[PDB]
Amino acid sequence: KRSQQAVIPNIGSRPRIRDIPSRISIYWTIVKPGDILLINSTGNLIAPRGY
Amino acid sequence: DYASLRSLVASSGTLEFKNESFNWTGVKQNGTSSACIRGSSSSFFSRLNWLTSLNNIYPAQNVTMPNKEQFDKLYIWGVHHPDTDKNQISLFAQSSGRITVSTKRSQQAVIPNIGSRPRIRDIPSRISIYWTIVKPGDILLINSTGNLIAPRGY
Amino acid sequence: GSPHQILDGGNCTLIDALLGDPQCDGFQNKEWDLFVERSRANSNCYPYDVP
Ligand SMILES: *[C@@H]1O[C@H](CO)[C@@H](O[C@@H]2O[C@H](CO)[C@@H](O[C@@H]3O[C@H](CO)[C@@H](O)[C@H](O[C@H]4O[C@H](CO)[C@@H](O)[C@H](O)[C@@H]4O)[C@@H]3O)[C@H](O)[C@H]2NC(C)=O)[C@H](O)[C@H]1NC(C)=O
């Protein structure tokens, strides 16, 4: 209710680390009492398992 | 980030350049502009290569350069910002470009922005400047489908 | 409030006054030397997010 984060994936070749040319970007969010966390995704989402 | 690059170059203390032979395939290099006049003919930046289409074809590029030496290497590259879609098609044969410059420890992905800007020296276009640092044992990978201003060395 | 010009903002944040909040209509074309923001300040217009 106080912040928004919109991310679009980037496709391209990166140097291989342990035989993987793809990467993962890590983001974080904070939810205060009385607030609600809304996740709206169409793809490329690494979901959280908890808090 | 103009102040950051200025501080880096000022604290470095040198403008020593070493030419590297990047393997660009199926493109037209050594672009020229009417604003950048060297002597009496048109020119461009000396340390920056402008890559346009050849025969209305701009093949995708995937170029690697390893650091086999014992010091850090600074690469200065850029991204073109055409004023209109017609200019983008006439220069890079595609509608939207994507540039990915990556090392084993970092990645920068950039998408050009098409739009009209005030004319400086009769040009409504702009060029954004980015830099990358490669440490010993690292590898620089440039993967661009368009709108790439390439480095000519380190 | 004698030596310094002081503008009191109740129910009105400075950004809300700048944007033109319905409750911020009294702060138009006003000058100050110190803007005092209160803890009861709230917004009553379209939601916004200044980056
Ligand atoms: C863009 O160009 C980059 C290079 O700049 C390229 O990345 C390279 O891809 C090749 C091919 O996938 C990678 O080679 C592999 O690397 C490791 C270590 O050697 C191994 O997993 C692989 O070995 C296999 O293949 C060998 C040859 O057949 C077999 O003998 C072996 O048994 C395995 O089957 C293979 O060598 C290479 O590591 C990267 N290099 C990098 C990332 O620096 C990338 O693929 C290009 N992107 C495209 C074409 O989209």
Ligand SMILES: *[C@@H]1O[C@H](CO)[C@@H](O[C@@H]2O[C@H](CO)[C@@H](O[C@@H]3O[C@H](CO)[C@@H](O)[C@H](O[C@H]4O[C@H](CO)[C@@H](O)[C@H](O)[C@@H]4O)[C@@H]3O)[C@H](O)[C@H]2NC(C)=O)[C@H](O)[C@H]1NC(C)=O
């Ligand atoms: C969006 O809006 C912008 C801003 O209005 C607009 O940019 C303007 O484009 C015109 C295109 O003609 C520019 O005019 C030219 O500018 C320079 C400096 O004057 C000269 O190169 C040109 O002079 C030639 O053309 C004249 C007209 O025929 C001749 O009389 C003269 O002898 C020369 O041959 C010409 O004046 C104008 O400067 C800009 N203005 C800016 C950038 O502020 C833009 O075109 C609009 N549209 C789009 C799609 O972006």
Ligand SMILES: *[C@@H]1O[C@H](CO)[C@@H](O[C@@H]2O[C@H](CO)[C@@H](O)[C@H](O)[C@H]2NC(C)=O)[C@H](O)[C@H]1NC(C)=O
């Ligand atoms: C990254 O480099 C690769 C390798 O050239 C590009 O992949 C090519 O993309 C074009 C355009 O879609 C295809 O026609 C080719 O078949 C692809 N080559 C393959 C799959 O070997 C890729 O477009 C480049 N750019 C990005 C942003 O990833």
Ligand SMILES: *[C@@H]1O[C@H](CO)[C@@H](O[C@@H]2O[C@H](CO)[C@@H](O)[C@H](O)[C@H]2NC(C)=O)[C@H](O)[C@H]1NC(C)=O
């Ligand atoms: C946000 O989530 C909603 C959940 O419905 C998505 O809406 C659906 O989008 C798909 C793909 O366009 C449509 O086929 C469906 O009909 C939509 N459902 C509706 C309208 O009830 C929406 O796409 C999501 N947006 C993002 C950016 O992830």
Ligand SMILES: *[C@@H]1O[C@H](CO)[C@@H](O[C@@H]2O[C@H](CO)[C@@H](O)[C@H](O)[C@H]2NC(C)=O)[C@H](O)[C@H]1NC(C)=O
């Ligand atoms: C800020 O808003 C509050 C809450 O509305 C105002 O206080 C009273 O609000 C009630 C409705 O809840 C009205 O009926 C009263 O007339 C308001 N009191 C007044 C106008 O004195 C409050 O006035 C607003 N302004 C400030 C500076 O606090």
Ligand SMILES: *[C@@H]1O[C@H](CO)[C@@H](O)[C@H](O)[C@H]1NC(C)=O
């Ligand atoms: C661009 O100019 C360089 C010298 O500055 C030359 O070596 C190279 O072959 C040229 N590329 C072309 C003509 O495509």
